[PDB]
From a paper:
The conversion of the chemical energy of ATP into mechanical work by myosin involves coordinated changes in the actomyosin affinity and the orientation of myosin cross-bridges relative to the fiber axis. Differences in A-states and R-states predominately involve the configuration of a long cleft that divides the myosin MD into upper and lower 50 kDa subdomains, the so-called actin binding cleft. IFM also produces sustained isometric contractions at pCa <4.5, which we refer to as isometric high static tension or iso-HST, that correspond to an isometric tetanus in vertebrate muscle. Here we report a more detailed view of the rich variety of myosin head forms in the iso-HST state resulting from improvements in both data collection and analysis that have increased the resolution by 2.5× over the earlier work.
Advancements in data collection and analysis for ET since the iso-HST state was first reported suggested that now is an opportune moment to reexamine this state as a reference for HST specimens subjected to a quick stretch or quick release that are currently under study. Adaptation to stretch would therefore require a different mechanism for rapidly placing more myosin heads on target-zone actins. It has been suggested that when a muscle is stretched, two-headed attachments increase by recruitment of second heads to single-headed bridges. Our results show that two-headed cross-bridges exist in isometrically contracting muscle even without stretch which shows directly that this mechanism for adapting to stretch is mechanically feasible in active IFM.
Residue numbers in the entry:
A (entry chain B): 14 to 163
B (entry chain M): 4 to 204, 218 to 571, 575 to 626, 647 to 843
C (entry chain C): 5 to 149
C-alpha cells in the first residue's frame, strides 16, 4: 500500500531527510547519527532508551529502503497536500471560503458505517480554532503534511 | 375601483366593487352536482343533483323541491368565475338557462346592460338610474368595449370610432317588444351623437319629429294607447372631420290596414281623431267633413275616443311640429287636405248598372269633395275607377269592373296614398335634418319592432316578421363573416357555411315571385277575388311543395303557418285583400300624377299595392344596412307587471329566442366559443403543471401555453391554437378552472412532484460525486492522528524544513 | 422484485452503516430511483401504517424493493403533455410567460406545499432580472434529470 500513493517528490523529500540524519554519509543511520542530529537541532537531553526505541521499530540496519518502508507503513492512508485540498475543494464546490462545522460532522458520520463521534470530537480539538472559524481546510492540509505547530 | 371614478356615482350600476366580485368568483363550487333544471311551473330553476336513475335525474331545488327529470332536462352550471359576466358569450356553458340566469342576476343587482356576443342586451329598469349621466357620456368616450363595462354608449361610441378608423358607415339596430323601451334608447343614443360631435358653433326638429310620425303612424291598440304601427330609420350624416352634417328620417308601418280597418277595441291613426276634434275648426270646413266619425266608416269601425288621450292638444302638437319641421304651408295644407280625401274615399259609394254587372257611381256628392281636395276632376276620377283603362298586349284596353271590385280598389288607393305620404313626410323631415355641407359617412339608427307572436297573426304581423327574419339573416351572416376572420387571424382550421343560409328558405317563400306576397298582390288585381280565393291560390301552389309552408293545427282561426327562425307563426288571412288594396288602378294613379296638388303629384312619380312598397322600402333599407358596419342592440322587458328588479322567466326566455340572442349563442357553441389570449392564459393556469418548467419558463408568451397543455387528463381535441390565442370548446375552460380551484390542485400537485422528484435526483448526483472526496478526506485525517505522535514523524517534521 | 444497482444505492443513503434505512427516508429514496411519486400516494399505502411500514421499509432491502416496484406501476403519469400546458394557464400573455412571484407562492402554499428553500432552489438562475420566467424551458430543465 506504501509504494502505491507515494510519488517521486515525496520519496526525494524522504531521501534528503535521511541524508541529513545520516551523519557519517555511510548509507545506514544508527544511534550515533540520531544523537548528533538531535544535538544539531538543540536537543542535548537525549537518553539511550529513546534512541533505542526509535531503532527497535526496524528488523535490520535502517538503510534507505528499510526507512522508506517503515515510514510508508505508518502513513498507509496519507496523501500529499494538493490531493487532500482537492477533496475539500469538491466539498467547497462554489469556491474560495471553506466549510462549516455541522456540514462535515454529518458527512463524516453519515454515508458508510462510521467516522466515529469519538474521532470527530478529537478532530475539532486537534483541528481547532481552524475547524471553528472557516473549518480552515487550507490550514488543516498544511498541519497534516507540515506538522502541528505550523 | 381605481379605474371607476369617471362614473363614480353610476359605477354601482355598471360594475361591482372589486371584492363584491372577488367574494363572488372565489367561493365554493361543486360542479358534478350543481345544475340547472327544467321546471313545470317556473321555467328553469337551479338545484343540486341527488341521485341518478341511469337516464333520469332527481334533483333538489333552491326553494326546496325534488323532481326526477330526464337526462336532458338537466343542464350544467357555470363555475362561480362567471357570475355576472359582462359577456355571456364568454361563459363555458352556452345553455338556455345560464343565459336567462345571468341576465337575471345582474339585474337584481341593478345592472341593465349585459352583452351576449355582439349584442347589447338592455333591460327596462322601471325606475331611475344615474346611467344616462352626463359624466358617463365622457367616460365612455374613446373606449373600446373591453376598457369599460357593458353599456350602450359603448356601442355608440365604438361606432363613431370605427366610423373614423375604418372609413366605413355604421348602424345600430335597436329591437324589442312593445314595452321593451326602445325609443328611449334610440333617443338616448341620438343625444349621444349630437353631444360628442357637435358643430353648431336640430335638437328640437330631432324631437319634434316624433309627434308628427305618431299622429300618422300611431294608434290605440288593445294593448297600448299609443302603439307604434311606427318604425324608424335615421341617418346621421357625419362630416369629413367627424363633426355633424346631416340627418335623414324614414318611417315604416304606421300598418296600412288601419287606414281602412280597425278592430273593435282599437282605432285608427290618431290624426283622424285629432282633426275631427275641432280645435282648429277651419280644418273641418276646409276638408269638408264633419266632427262625428261615424260619418267615416274607414275610421270608426272600432273606437273613436280614448280617455287617456286629448286629441285637441295633440292636434296642435302635431300642427306645430309640422311647422318646425320646415314644411311649406301648402304642403302642410296638402297633408291635411290629403288626409281627408282618404276619409271621403271610404264614403265613396257605388251601384250596379241595370242588367249589367258593372259598377256605376252611386252619386257625385263625395267624389266631388275627394276630387277637389286632391286637385282632381270628379268625372275623370269616377270613370277611371269604374272603367279602368288597362294596357294588355301593346295597347291600352278598357276594362270594366264590378261593384266589389271598385270598393276594393278605392280602398287600395286610400291605403296607397296614405302610405306614400307618410313616406314622403319622413323624407321631408330627413331633409331638414338637409344641409349643403359635405358628408363622408353616416351612422344609421334603426328602430323597429321585433318578431312578436300572437295567437292572432294578421297581415301586419307578416310584414313585421318578415322584416325581422331578414334582419336576423343579416346578422347571422355578419357573424359568419366575422367568425371566419378569427380562425383566419389565428390560424385555426375551421370550415363552415354561412349562417344566414339557414333562413333563405323562409325568405324566398315570402319575397320571391310565386311567393306569398306575389300571390297576394296579384289577386289584388282580380276585380272579383276573395280572401278565400287568395287562400286557395296560396295552397295549390305552395302546399306540399314547400316545407316552410304548412296548414294550421287547430287549437282564433288560422289559414297558414310559416316556419320562421323564431318559430311557427299561424297566420289569418282575412282582410288582406282589402287592406292590401287601400295592385293599384293605374288609370287613377294617372290622374294623381297630373294633379293640381303638387305634393300629391309628387308622391306618385316613381310609378299598386300596399305590400308592393313595404317591400321596396324594406329593400332600400336592407341595402342601406349592407353598406354599413352593423352594430346590434337588443332591448328587453322584464315583467308585464312593471316592477323594477324583477323578471318573469318565460317572458324573458321568449324574447331571447325571437331576439337573436339565443341564436347567436348557438352559432357560438358550434365553433370554438371561448378564446384565450396567451399571457392571460399563462398567468391564470401556470399552476396546473407549473413544472412543465425549465423549457416552460425560459420562455415565450405563446409556445408556453402550448407546452403547458402538455399535462392534464384533458381532451387535446377541444382546443386549437393560433397566432394570438387558443381556441376552446365549451365547459372546458370550466374544467380548467376546477383543477385550478380543484383543477389546479391537479395541475400543481403534479407539477410539484416532478420537482420534488427531480430535486432529489440531483442530490444523488452530488452524493455520488462526493463519494470519494470524502474517503480521501476520511482516511487522510486518521493517518495524522496516528502519526503525529510517532518519533520518526516528528523528526521528519522538524527536519522537513532544512530541505530543499 | 428485481435489478442490482438499486441495492448498491441503498447503502449510499444508510447514514449509520447498518443497511437499514428509515420509513421517512423511504419517500425520498424512491424519488431518485428512476421515477416520481407524490406525497399523499407514499403516505397512502404502507406509509399510513407506522408499525407496519417500520416493519415493511424502515428496514433492509427486502421491503424497500417491493415498495419501490409498487410506485413503478403508477408512473405512466410521467407524460409531459399536460405539464407545459398547465403552466401556460397561470401567466398567458404571448409566449410561455410566467412571473417569479406567482410560481414561487403557488408552489409553496398550495396542494402539497414545498419549502421556500426548495422553491428558491428550483429557481436556480432560470429567472433572471426580467421578472418574467419562460415556462417551456423550465419543464425541460425540471424533467432533465
Amino acid at each position: 500500500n506504501v509504494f502505491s500513493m507515494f510519488d517521486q517528490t515525496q520519496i526525494q523529500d524522504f531521501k534528503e531527510a535521511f541524508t541529513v540524519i545520516d551523519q557519517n554519509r555511510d548509507g545506514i543511520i544508527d544511534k550515533d547519527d540520531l544523537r548528533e542530529t538531535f544535538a544539531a537541532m538543540g536537543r542535548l537531553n537525549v537518553k539511550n532508551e529513546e534512541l533505542d526505541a526509535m531503532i527497535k521499530e526496524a528488523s535490520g540496519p535502517i538503510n534507505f529502503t528499510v526507512f522508506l518502508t517503515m515510514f510508508g507503513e505508518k502513513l498507509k492512508g496519507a496523501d500529499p497536500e494538493d490531493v487532500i485540498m482537492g477533496a475539500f475543494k469538491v466539498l467547497d464546490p462554489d469556491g474560495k471560503g471553506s466549510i462549516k462545522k455541522s456540514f462535515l460532522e454529518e458527512l463524516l458520520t453519515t454515508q458508510c458505517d462510521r467516522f466515529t463521534p469519538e474521532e470527530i470530537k478529537n478532530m475539532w480539538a486537534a483541528f481547532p480554532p481552524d475547524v471553528a472559524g472557516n473549518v480552515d481546510y487550507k490550514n488543516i492540509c498544511y498541519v497534516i503534511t507540515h506538522g502541528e505547530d505550523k | 375601483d381605481a379605474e371607476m371614478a369617471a362614473f363614480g356615482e353610476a359605477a354601482p350600476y355598471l360594475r361591482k366593487s372589486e371584492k363584491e366580485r372577488i367574494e363572488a368568483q372565489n367561493k365554493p363550487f361543486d360542479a358534478k352536482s350543481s345544475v340547472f333544471v327544467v321546471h313545470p311551473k317556473e321555467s328553469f330553476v337551479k338545484g343540486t343533483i341527488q341521485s341518478k336513475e341511469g337516464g333520469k335525474v332527481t334533483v333538489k331545488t333552491e326553494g326546496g323541491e325534488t323532481l326526477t327529470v330526464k337526462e336532458d332536462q338537466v343542464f350544467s352550471m357555470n363555475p362561480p368565475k362567471y357570475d355576472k359576466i359582462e359577456d355571456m358569450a364568454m361563459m363555458t356553458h352556452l345553455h338556455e338557462p345560464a343565459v336567462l340566469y345571468n341576465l337575471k342576476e345582474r339585474y337584481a343587482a341593478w345592472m341593465i346592460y349585459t352583452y351576449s356576443g355582439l349584442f347589447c342586451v338592455t333591460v327596462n329598469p322601471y325606475k331611475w338610474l344615474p346611467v344616462y349621466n352626463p359624466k358617463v357620456v365622457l367616460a365612455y368616450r374613446g373606449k373600446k368595449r373591453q376598457e369599460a363595462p357593458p353599456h350602450i354608449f359603448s356601442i355608440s361610441d365604438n361606432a363613431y370610432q370605427f366610423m373614423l378608423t375604418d372609413r366605413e358607415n355604421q348602424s345600430i339596430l335597436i329591437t324589442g317588444e312593445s314595452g321593451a323601451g326602445k325609443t328611449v334608447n334610440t333617443k338616448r343614443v341620438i343625444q349621444y351623437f349630437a353631444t360628442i360631435a357637435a358643430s353648431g358653433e336640430l335638437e328640437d326638429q330631432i324631437i319634434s319629429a316624433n309627434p308628427l310620425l305618431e299622429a300618422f303612424g300611431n294608434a290605440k291598440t288593445v294593448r297600448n294607447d299609443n302603439s307604434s304601427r311606427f318604425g324608424k330609420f335615421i341617418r346621421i350624416h357625419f362630416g369629413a372631420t367627424g363633426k355633424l352634417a346631416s340627418a335623414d328620417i324614414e318611417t315604416y308601418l304606421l300598418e296600412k290596414s288601419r287606414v281602412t280597418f280597425q278592430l273593435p277595441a282599437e282605432r285608427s291613426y290618431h290624426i283622424f281623431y285629432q282633426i275631427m276634434s275641432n280645435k282648429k275648426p277651419e280644418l273641418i270646413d276646409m276638408l269638408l267633413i264633419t266632427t262625428n266619425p261615424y260619418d267615416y266608416h274607414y275610421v270608426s269601425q272600432g273606437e273613436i275616443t280614448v280617455p287617456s288621450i286629448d286629441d285637441q292638444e295633440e292636434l296642435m302638437a302635431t300642427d306645430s311640429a309640422i311647422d318646425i319641421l320646415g314644411f311649406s304651408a301648402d304642403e302642410k295644407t296638402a297633408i291635411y287636405k290629403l288626409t281627408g280625401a282618404v276619409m271621403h274615399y271610404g264614403n265613396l259609394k257605388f251601384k250596379q248598372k241595370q242588367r249589367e254587372e258593372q259598377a256605376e257611381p252611386d252619386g257625385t256628392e263625395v267624389a266631388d269633395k275627394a276630387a277637389y281636395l286632391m286637385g282632381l276632376n270628379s268625372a275623370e276620377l269616377l270613370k277611371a275607377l269604374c272603367y279602368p283603362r288597362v294596357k294588355v298586349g301593346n295597347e291600352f284596353v278598357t276594362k270594366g269592373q264590378t261593384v266589389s271590385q271598385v270598393h276594393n280598389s278605392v280602398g287600395a288607393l286610400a291605403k296607397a296614398v296614405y302610405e306614400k305620404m307618410f313616406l314622403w313626410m319622413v323624407i321631408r323631415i330627413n331633409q331638414q335634418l338637409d344641409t349643403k355641407q359635405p358628408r363622408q359617412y353616416f351612422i344609421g339608427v334603426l328602430d323597429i319592432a321585433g318578431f312578436e307572436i300572437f295567437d292572432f297573426n294578421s297581415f301586419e304581423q307578416l310584414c313585421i316578421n318578415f322584416t325581422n327574419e331578414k334582419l336576423q339573416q343579416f346578422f347571422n351572416h355578419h357573424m359568419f363573416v366575422l367568425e371566419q376572420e378569427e380562425y383566419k387571424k389565428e390560424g385555426i382550421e375551421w370550415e363552415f357555411i354561412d349562417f344566414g343560409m339557414d333562413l333563405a328558405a323562409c325568405i324566398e317563400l315570402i319575397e320571391k315571385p310565386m311567393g306569398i306576397f306575389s300571390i297576394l298582390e296579384e289577386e289584388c288585381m282580380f276585380p272579383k277575388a276573395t280572401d278565400t280565393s287568395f287562400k286557395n291560390k296560396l295552397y295549390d301552389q305552395h302546399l306540399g311543395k314547400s316545407n316552410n309552408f304548412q296548414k294550421p293545427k287547430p287549437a282564433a282561426e288560422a289559414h297558414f303557418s310559416l316556419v320562421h327562425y323564431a318559430g311557427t307563426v299561424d297566420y289569418n288571412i282575412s282582410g288582406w285583400l282589402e287592406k292590401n288594396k287601400d295592385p293599384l288602378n293605374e288609370t287613377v294613379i294617372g290622374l294623381y300624377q297630373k294633379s293640381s296638388v303638387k305634393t300629391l303629384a309628387l308622391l306618385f312619380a316613381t310609378y299598386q299595392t300596399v305590400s308592393a312598397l313595404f317591400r321596396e322600402n324594406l329593400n332600400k333599407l336592407m341595402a342601406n344596412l349592407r353598406s354599413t358596419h352593423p352594430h346590434f342592440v337588443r332591448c328587453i322587458i322584464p315583467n308585464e307587471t312593471k316592477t323594477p328588479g324583477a323578471m318573469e322567466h318565460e317572458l324573458v326566455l321568449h324574447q331571447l329566442r325571437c331576439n337573436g340572442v339565443l341564436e347567436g349563442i348557438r352559432i357560438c357553441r358550434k365553433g370554438f366559443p371561448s378564446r384565450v389570449l396567451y399571457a392571460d392564459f399563462k398567468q391564470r393556469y401556470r399552476v396546473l403543471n407549473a413544472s412543465a418548467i425549465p423549457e416552460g419558463q425560459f420562455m415565450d408568451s405563446k409556445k408556453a401555453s402550448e407546452k403547458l397543455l402538455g399535462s392534464i387528463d384533458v381532451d387535446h381535441t377541444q382546443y386549437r391554437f393560433g397566432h394570438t390565442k387558443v381556441f376552446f370548446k365549451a365547459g372546458l375552460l370550466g374544467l380548467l378552472e376546477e383543477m385550478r380551484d380543484d383543477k389546479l390542485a391537479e395541475i400543481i400537485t403534479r407539477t410539484q412532484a416532478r420537482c420534488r422528484g427531480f430535486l432529489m435526483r440531483v442530490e444523488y448526483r452530488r452524493m455520488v460525486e462526493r463519494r470519494e472526496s470524502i474517503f480521501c478526506i476520511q482516511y487522510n485525517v486518521r493517518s495524522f492522528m496516528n502519526v503525529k505522535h510517532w518519533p520518526w514523524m516528528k523528526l521528519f517534521f522538524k527536519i522537513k524544513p532544512l530541505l530543499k | 422484485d428485481e435489478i442490482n444497482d438499486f441495492k448498491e444505492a441503498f447503502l449510499l443513503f444508510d447514514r449509520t452503516g447498518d443497511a437499514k434505512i428509515t420509513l421517512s427516508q423511504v419517500g425520498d429514496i424512491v424519488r431518485a430511483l428512476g421515477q416520481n411519486p407524490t406525497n399523499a400516494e407514499i403516505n397512502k399505502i404502507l406509509g399510513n401504517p407506522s408499525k407496519e411500514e417500520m416493519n415493511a421499509k424502515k428496514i433492509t432491502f427486502e421491503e424497500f424493493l417491493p415498495m419501490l416496484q409498487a410506485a413503478a406501476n403508477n408512473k405512466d403519469q410521467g407524460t409531459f403533455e399536460d405539464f407545459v400546458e398547465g403552466l401556460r394557464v397561470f401567466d398567458k400573455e404571448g409566449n410561455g410567460t410566467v412571473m417569479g412571484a406567482e410560481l414561487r407562492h403557488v408552489l409553496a402554499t398550495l396542494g402539497e406545499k414545498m419549502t421556500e428553500e426548495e422553491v428558491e432552489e428550483l429557481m436556480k438562475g432560470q429567472e433572471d432580472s426580467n421578472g418574467c420566467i419562460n415556462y417551456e424551458a423550465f419543464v425541460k430543465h425540471i424533467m432533465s434529470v
